[PDB]
Structures are given as structure tokens and as C-alpha cells.
């Protein structure tokens, strides 16, 4: 005969890369002239 209805199987409720670590500025060497 006719059985009960069947419930549906539906649920029925791009990643931007994480910023990388850039290295810090390299401390540039700071020249005393002759007289």
C-alpha cells in the first residue's frame, strides 16, 4: 500500500591567503672626515 512520506536529504539550513610575515628593515650602518 501507501507508506509514509520520506524526508528529503537536503541540508535545509574563496579564501584570500592569510598575510605572510615580511622581514624587518635591515639597520643600515650609520663617516668622520679628515681636518
Amino acid at each position: 500500500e501507501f507508506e509514509n512520506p520520506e524526508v528529503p536529504r537536503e541540508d535545509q539550513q574563496p579564501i584570500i591567503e592569510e598575510p605572510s610575515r615580511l622581514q624587518e628593515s635591515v639597520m643600515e650602518a650609520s663617516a668622520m672626515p679628515p681636518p
Partner: protein, 1424 residues
Amino acid sequence: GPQAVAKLLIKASAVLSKSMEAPSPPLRALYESCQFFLSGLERGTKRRYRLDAILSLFAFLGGYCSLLQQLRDDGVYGGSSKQQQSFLQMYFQGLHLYTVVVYDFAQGCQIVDLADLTQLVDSCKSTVVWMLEALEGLSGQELTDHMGMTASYTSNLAYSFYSHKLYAEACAISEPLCQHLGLVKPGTYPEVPPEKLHRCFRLQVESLKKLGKQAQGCKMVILWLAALQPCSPEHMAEPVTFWVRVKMDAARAGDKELQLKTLRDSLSGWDPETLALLLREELQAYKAVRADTGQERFNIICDLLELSPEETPAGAWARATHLVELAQVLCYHDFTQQTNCSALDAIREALQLLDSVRPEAQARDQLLDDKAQALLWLYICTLEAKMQEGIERDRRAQFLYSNIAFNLAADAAQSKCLDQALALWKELLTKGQAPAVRCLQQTAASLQILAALYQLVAKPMQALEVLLLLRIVSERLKDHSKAAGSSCHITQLLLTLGCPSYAQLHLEEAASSLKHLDQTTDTYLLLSLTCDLLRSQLYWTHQKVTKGVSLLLSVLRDPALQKSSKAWYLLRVQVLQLVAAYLSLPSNNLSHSLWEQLCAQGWQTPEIALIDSHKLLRSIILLLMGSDILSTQKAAVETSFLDYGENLVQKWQVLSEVLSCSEKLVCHLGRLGSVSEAKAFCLEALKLTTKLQIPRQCALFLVLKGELELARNDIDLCQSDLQQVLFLLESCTEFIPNFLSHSPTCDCSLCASPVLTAVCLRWVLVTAGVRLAMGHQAQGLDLLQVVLKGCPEAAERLTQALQASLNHKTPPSLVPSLLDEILAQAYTLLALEGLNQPSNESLQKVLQSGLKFVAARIPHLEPWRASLLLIWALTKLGTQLFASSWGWQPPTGLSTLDSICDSLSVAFRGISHCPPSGLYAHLCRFLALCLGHRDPYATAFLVTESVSITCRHQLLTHLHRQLSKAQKHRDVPLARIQRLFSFRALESGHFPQPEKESFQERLALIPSGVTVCVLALATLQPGTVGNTLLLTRLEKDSPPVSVQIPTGQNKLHLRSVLNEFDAIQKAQKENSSCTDKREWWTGRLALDHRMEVLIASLEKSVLGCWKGLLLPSSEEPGPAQEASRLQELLQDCGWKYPDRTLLKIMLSGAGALTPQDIQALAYGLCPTQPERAQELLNEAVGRLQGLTVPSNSHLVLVLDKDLQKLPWESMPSLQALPVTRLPSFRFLLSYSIIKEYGASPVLSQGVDPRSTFYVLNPHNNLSSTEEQFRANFSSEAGWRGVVGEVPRPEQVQEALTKHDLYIYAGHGAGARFLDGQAVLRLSCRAVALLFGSSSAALAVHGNLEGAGIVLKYIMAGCPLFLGNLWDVTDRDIDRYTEALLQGWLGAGPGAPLLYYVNQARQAPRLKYLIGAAPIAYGLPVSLR
């Protein structure tokens, strides 16, 4: 000679000894000494001596000086003061000789000799003391000038000792002089040149600095301050800089005692004005240095504020300036608690005091500068407060609401402030006179910050004006680094606007300024590389690609580009953007060699380079300001800003560059059809703009988002975004839409700004698209004509305004090329609409007008030119012109077809390098139709290259990341797959030569026993679905076979089948909610019958006789011989294009060749003599019946975005064969490569049934499924997983990566806990059995290609993916899953899964409604 020098020294010593015993005046001896000195002077030219010799010389010289002083003391020279002065001059001459001897000895002194040099230094100290002692009593400028000469001589000798590391001895020699100068009264030595005094103190201070006696050296700095008592503080600006450097050494070492001693504490009793001036100079020097100097500057400003008397108006001005400095300090540091005053309060008080102050007609320039600075920092601090409150609001919320609430009177007020600052600075600097400011370096730094602000808020013209003022200042300051940097900024900005000529002039200015700088400093390298990059961009604009590429390659190969500094990082971003600009060009532009060289650097696709630029920009943001402005995480990070001048400019510059790069990424990705990533970038940019509260950028990105939503066909959301844009525009102009109907020349905020004009024109374009989509013609057309009329007017206004700003006489040669894309898109839409209406001639004229417009701009607007060429070919099209190019039919450019082929070839080579997803498919299928069997390999290649293009782009981007992450960890298979999927792997030649050899190699790579059939629909009007089916069969060692099936002439066309399938899905949706059981079942049965009829129609009418092109070829020789005879026997009956491979494939299935199939085949293939062809085909089938035997091979189905919906595997012919699906043929080749390199264990060894992870009923919505599967799954050996609970993502990642099988029995494809990005970020080593609803379905939104998680699984390397095509119920799919699992697992080792898939298809009750849902993606799998 050593002995000779010793004898001379002995003579000198004996003379000195005799002189000592000589009581009577040795006046004659003094004369003799003068002669000896003269001999030494003549020998002085040589300047060569030992050390005891120099010591003996010093001893003799000492006696000479003693005699000179003795004579001066003696009444003889005592009364004759002139003789005493002459005696002093004689001693001074001896001193000059001593200085020369010391310098010579020091120069010759080696590292080891330093010990004797130390002894000489002791003598030098005594000489300096004797010189100062003689100086005592000197009266008169000349006498003091003579004393200065003595000090200068000592200073020369001091430098020698300083260079000899004898810093202690050098300091000791200088100490006497410095001490006298430090303790000397004011105005005692006014003549003495300051630089001489500086030199003397410099050596001692630096010595005291290097030796680490900073404390001691700091006190001598006070003596250095005291020595220049009457000297202007400009000379004193060197001690101030030296002082801060001394204090910085203490700060680096952590010393606090030096930091305790400040200027007010040190002098303690100088005059208030000079003391305040020195405090101001100290603050300036601190602001020049790097590292955190917040508290030091705060202390200096606190003493400055204490000094300033508020009652005196000059004191009021001083307090206003110091309050501006205090606002700068408080505006980035948490010092409010101590001062009990916010930065905004300080700046408002300062502005009030400034407004109160009246100038004295000589300090008006400084009044202007101070007011401008106060206004600028008011803006900056209010912007900081706005950003902080935005971060807090987003943290509390953790959209679409703030986006429409940006424009407030605050924006008008906040901006007015910036324009007032710009006007004040422009008034100050535009006059000829050099501004009489205190520090013109601050006017320069603040102008830089203002230009960065103006660019950030999307007002590039005022930024150009500010940069011109900065150039004026740098020329006035004679600082060439700043001049070159400003010129480079102006050139880059002008290139962004679209005027290359002014960019060329300013690049020449930058180079000319660059010649002055030293060619060793890092700034020179930065500016030279920037100039080369700008020249490369200019050549790229002026169609000088060859030379431009060489410059770019030179820039990229320069090792200096990869230094660790923020300036280099910002340069690399522009390098990557220029790489993208070059990579966007067609192949005709550059030679193959240079194309390979450019792609060998690391970036293949323009989107890859732009994404890398975006990532680098965000990395710079992270390094500079932290991560709060990007991510709204609770206390993500708290990195200090560390404002030191350049940091403040770089903050705003990086934010503006992030926004601009996000625009190019969104536009480029949306143009290509990749709308999901484009929307992701558009939303990230809108979030950033929401935090910063900038209505202009929000409006621009909202328009872009509306365009993307129109592309995805979501009119409601697109209309919402357009309405928000309309609110923002109507608020901006205040603080059919009314912003139209303007004069061609107008100065409203919208008309005077190119950015706002572009936003308005794009709004009109998107609204026209919406009207056309919603069926409202005659309105979208009108909006498109509005865009057509508006773009040239906006270009002319931009030209006029640039002419006004830069003050040139010659107008630009060409109008800026920035609205060309909008105008080309409008032309494309107008021509596409004219396709629908051939009666209207106006759109026919629009087609040609757009063609001229895009042909006049090559190679910039190539995609639009390709679209217009395709529309032109379609117009020339109007049983077909393609019938003559195919062997089977349903039962001036020479001719039209050749001209169409030429135009389509031009379009193809115009887009082949980076093709849009839809246009590429259209061109490929139209060109395949036009070509046919005339060029079979070209037709097969074109049909293959029209399926899954967005998947190709996504795979290219994914392979880049896999390579970048591997390079970071540390690749041959990845490089090979990149070459396989590349659009630039072709050689140089004419179409289709280069494309053919590539396809021939790909065909040679086909695995044995695999048939690849591509079913694509040819569309004769883009945006619709065609009724012509293109079938191409590809097999190893077999020429490709292509066929065309026009289904439109007969009833039951492919469009009707698609409509019926959609109706079945819709009816199933509606019926799923019915409560009654007696109606639900009846509806389900009716739908099952309808779907059965649909599959029967697919087998019978859609394909017809050409259903055997999907069946395995017979290995028996019978079909080969029959084809060999019948080719010659049928060429005579009217077969235009004889093909043995076609006959072989079709006859391999002679057993299943119904007489209707033979009738159709004969009557179409041979229309001149149909009966005879039928007779021979029947005889061949009779000879081949029974003789042929079934083979053992595999079939791969490659279907376009419309055909994946239909269940092709459920047709009667295919119901007993292993059939799978793949996005493209390139994916089968990639699988072969990966299997060759051993990266797919499942495809190589087999599925181990002891390694399975199952997810069962996650959210507890299904009880039958759990009760049916729980015990069965738990009882299995070695199976783990979850049941009744959602699974953790790190569990499912391990399930996919470290397991051979993965069974999912639940809702959907499991996207809630396993997104597409998650699976794409890992390697799939499992066979995904997803038994949800629409698990293997590709959602087709608009004209975009199908999107789904199955593509992510395949690109991740999944061997086989089993999923349902349409929504399913629970009990029937439970039955199918049970049948499939039981059959496959109980079959023992070596059991193919596809056979049991097709077997279990007979398990469900509704055979065709449920069993036909599952499909397979990938390659066949079996147990080990």
C-alpha cells in the same frame, strides 16, 4: 739616515744642553735655530722620519718655543711687543711644522706602530697645552684668530689620532682646547669659524661616543653648547643632532641616566628663548630618528608648554605649536592618562590659539605653515578615532548597513580641513620667495603625508597638486632624493589616471634629479629601479613592449629588489602589477623566447601576479599597523605603529595601494567569469572601506559588487547594492537619478572627480544590465547610450583638469585611457542587443562603431574586440553555412565562411592567453562549427578547449600556491601540470599550427584503453542554449572523430530535454513538502516515469545513430577491413569527407545497429545515393554481426555547463559500461602524470577496505539512515568515524588525506564542515562517497560555468568522487548505499567500483528518480 738622524738629534741635544748651560741670551742661537727650522722645512717636502728622531725633534722644538717665550718675556721683546708677536708667529710656524710632521708620521704609521704613535700623542697633548698657554694673554681679533689657527692645527693632528683609534689620546689633546672653549665667556672668540670649533668638539664627542663614555661626552656637549654661546642655534643644530644620537646609544643599551639629563635640566639658567629653541631642535632631531621616541618627545613638549607664557601673544603662538606636537605624540600613544587631555582636544585648542594669533608681517609664513599642520593633524587624529571605533564596532558585531551610512556631515567637515591645509601650503610655497619657516623639512614630511591621505580618500588630483608642491620644496631644499621620489610619484599617479605624456616628462625629471645622488646609497638603487619600472610601464603603454620587457627582466633580475625594507617591498608590488600588465597582452606582442623568460620568473596568469601583489600589500599592512584593520579578531595583535615620519606616509600609501589592487583583482576576475573570488575580494575591500569610513571607495566597490551579482543573476541583491550606491552618490553631491542631465563641463564633486564619474557611469551600466535582464528594453538601451555619451565627456574634463593642474601649454596627445573599458563594455552590450533586433539599423551601426573604437586601441581592449568580432560573425551568419564543412547532415575575405573563420581566429589569438570563460567557449565552438572536417585536429582541439575554463584558471592559481608553499618549505609534477594547463605553452606560428602540435602531444599522452567523449552545445546567440550538439571522440593511436547533431529541426530538441529536467526538479521540490502520503507517492511515481521518458529521449532523439561514438572500439580486425572497403565504396555515393576511423568505431557495434540507425547514417552520410549506401552498410553489418566481441576499456564524459545535469550514464547503451566524468581532458592527462610520479596511491595500488572514515547523521535530522547504517558501519573492521554529532574539521582533513575511503551519509556534500577551500588546501587520497543531495551537482548561475565541491575534490586529486546529481530522499538512497557497499565490499579484492555502482542503481524503488541520481567523477578504482 738613522745614524745621520741620530747625529742630527745629538747635535740638537748638544745645542739644547749648551743652551741650558747658556746664561747669556741665546739670541744668536735663536737665529741659528731659525736656520735649522728652515732646513727642516726644505726636508718637510719629503716628510720622512723615525720615532726617536721625531721625539728628538719635539725636544729641540720645545727648547725653541722656550727661547721664543724667554725672548718675548725678556724686556727686549717685552718692550718690543711686535718682536714678541713675531716670536709668537715663529713659535706658530714651528707648531705648523709639528702638525705637518705628526700628520705624515700618522699616515705612514702601521697598525703595529700605534705604540710609538701613542708616545707621539703624549707629546702632541703637551704641544697643545703649550699652544693654549701661549694663547693666554692674546688680545685683538688677529690674536684670537691666531689662537684659532693653533686650535685648527691641533684639530688636524686630533683627527689623525682619532683615525688611529687613539680616541682617548685624541680626546685628551682636544680636552684642553675644548675645556677652554667650553669655559670661555660669551663673545670672547666671536671671529673663530664655528665649523673649526665643531670639528674639535666633533672628534672628542664622537670619541666619547664610541668609547662608550656617552655620559662624559654628553657633558662636553654642554660645553659644546656653552662654547657657541653667541653663535646662532643653526651652528648649534649640530650639537643637537649629536646629542640625540648620544642619547639613542643609551636607549639602545638601556641606560637611563642619560635620558634623565635633558636640556632644561642640563643648562639650568640659559635665557628662555634660546633654551626653548634648543628644546625645539632636540624634538626635531628625535622626530627624525627611528625607534619609539614617544616619551622623550612627550617630555620635550611638556617643558616647551611649561615655558610658553599663555598671557603673552607670542607665548600663545608657542603653546599652539607645542600643542600641535603634543597632539602628534598623543595621537599614536597612550599618554592621555598623564596629560588628562585627548589628542583631539589638544589640536582643537591649538587651532583656536592659532586663529587668535595675528602675524607680524614677517612671521606670516610660519603662521600659514602652523595652521596647515594643525588642520592636517586634526584630520589625522579624527581619522584614527574613526578607525578605532570601526574596529571596536566590528569586534562587537563579530555588514550592508554601515556601507550606506558612511557619508555624514563629518566627511564634508573632515575633508574641508584637508583642502584648507592644502590651500594654506600652496599659498605659502607658490610664491617666488623662499618660505621663512623654521624647518622646511617638516613642510616636506607633512606634504608627503597629505598626498598619501589624498590618494587614500580617492582624490588623486589634489594629491598631484600636493606632490607638485613637494617637488617645489625639494628643489628649494636642494635635496635631490626627495625630488626624484616626488617625480616618480607624480609619474606613477599620472600613469594611473591615463596620461602617458606627462608621465614621460616627469620620469625625465626624476632621472635628471637622480643623476645628482651618490650612486652607492640605497636610495639611489631604489630610485633607479623605480625609474626603470616606470620606463617599462611607459613602453608598455606606447607599444614598445620588446624594449619594455627587457627593462622589466633587468629590474626583476636585479638582486637589490629583494632587500629587507618596506620601500623595497612596496616596489616589488608595482613590479608584480607590471608583470600582470605584460602578461595580459596577446602573444603577437612579444617573441616566444621573451614570453618564456617572463613566465619563468614565477608568475604565469595576470591574476596570479595581482594576487601576489595583494598578499604582499597585506603583509606590509601586518608589518606596519598590525592586523586589526584587516581582521576583526578579538585582540588579534598589538604591534606599535612606530611613527617616524616615513612610517606615517607608508601607512596611508599601503592602504591606498591595497584598495587599488583589490579593484584590479575584482575587475580582472569578474571579467574572466570567476565571480566567487571576485566577490570575496570585493567584500574584503568593502569591510576595509567600512572601517576607514570612506564613502567614495565604498561606492566604487559596491558598484563592482552589483556588477558581480548581475553576472550571477541575483537582481534583488544587485538592486540593493545599486540603491546603496545611489544613496552614497546623492549624499556626496549634497555634502532617473539627478546626477545625470549635467552639462558636458561641470564642477560638482561628481564631475570634478574622475573616480566618482567612473562610479556613476558603472552604476548606469549595471542598471542597464538589470533592465535588460528584467525584460525592460528601451530603458537599458537608453542607459547604455547615456554611458556612450558620457565617457568621452568625462575624458575631456579629465584632460582639461590635468592641463590646469600641471600648467602645460601643449594639451596631451591623447585623452586619458581610463574609461575605455566602460565604453567598450557598453558597446559590447549594445551590439549584443542588436543581435536580437536585426530590424533596427542603429545597433548595426553601433557594431561597426565599437569595432573601430576597439581596433584603434590595440592591444589594450582585446576581450571587447573579440566579443565584437564574434557578434559580427553571428550577424554575417544570418541548412546552414556549416553544412558544407561536415560529412553528415540530418536525413572581401573570399566566401562568408572563410571571412568568419578569419575573424574568429583573430578573436581567438586575441583572448587565448587569458580567456574569459564564456567568450572562449563561444569562439571555440563557433570556429569548430565553421571548420568541421576540413581541419579535424583543429575542430577537436577547439571542442576540447571550450569546457571547464574557470576550472583551468583555478587549477593554475592552486598550482602556484602549491609551488610557492613548496618553495617556502624548500615540484616536477607540478611544473608539468602547469605546462599542461598553461595558455602560453604554444610555439610561434599562424592558427592553428601552434595549437595543433600542442593538441597532438596531448593526444599522444592519452592512456591506453580510454575513450574521451566531449559533449558540448554550440550556441548561436550568447546567453541562450543551442540545439546543436558537438561530439568529439578521442582515443590513443586513433585520429579524433568529431560530429555535429542539429536537434532543433525535429521535435524533442536538447533545449526541450533541459526544460523537462528542470520542470521535474521543480515539481519534485514542490512535492517534497506534501503532508499527505497518498498524493506524495503518486507524484513521485509520475516524476519517475517522466524521468524515464527523458532518459529514453536522450538515448533515442538527442543522440540518434551517433550513440556508438561512446562505445569501446572492437579489437578484432573486422571493422578495420570493412571500413577500408567502405571508404572507397562510399566516396562514390556522395560522402564528402571519408573517415575510416569513424566507420571503424560505428561498425564495432554492428550487433546493436538498428536498421533505423543504418538508414539515418546512410541517408545523411551519402545523400546523393542513399539507397546504395544503405545497401553496403547493411551488408557490412551482416558480415560483422556476431563476429565483433565486446572489449574491455573505460569511457570518460566531458560535458559542458548545461549537459552535466542530465543523467547520461543511465541511458540504455551506457547502463552496462564503466563511465566516469571529468572536467576536461587535461584532467585525465594530469591524473596520468600524477600516477607516473606516484602521488596517487589509490589509483596505483588500490583501495584498502581497512581504512575508511564515515560521517553518519551529523545534525540528527535523519533517524532511518542512522538506524540503518550505524551497526553495519561500526561492525566493519578498521573503520572509524562519527555518528550523531558534527565532525571537527581537523578530523575530516585527516579522513580525506590519510584514508583510502571516505563514506558520507548525510545532508548535502558535507560543505558545512568541509568547505571547498578546506579540501582544496589538502591532497585527496580517498575515494569520496558522498551520498547526500546534489553532492555531485554543478550549480549554473546565469551564463557562468557550473560550480560545486566536486571540482574542488578533483583538483585536490580525488581518484573517484561518487555523488548525487539531484536532490534525493532518505530511504531509497539508504537502499542504494546499502546495495552498493554490500556488493563492492563483499566482492573481494580487485573489484571495480563502477560496475557495482551501476548494479546498485537497480536497488532503489523509484529506479530512475533515485538510482539515476548518482554519478562518478574521476577514474575507475578497485580494491587491492
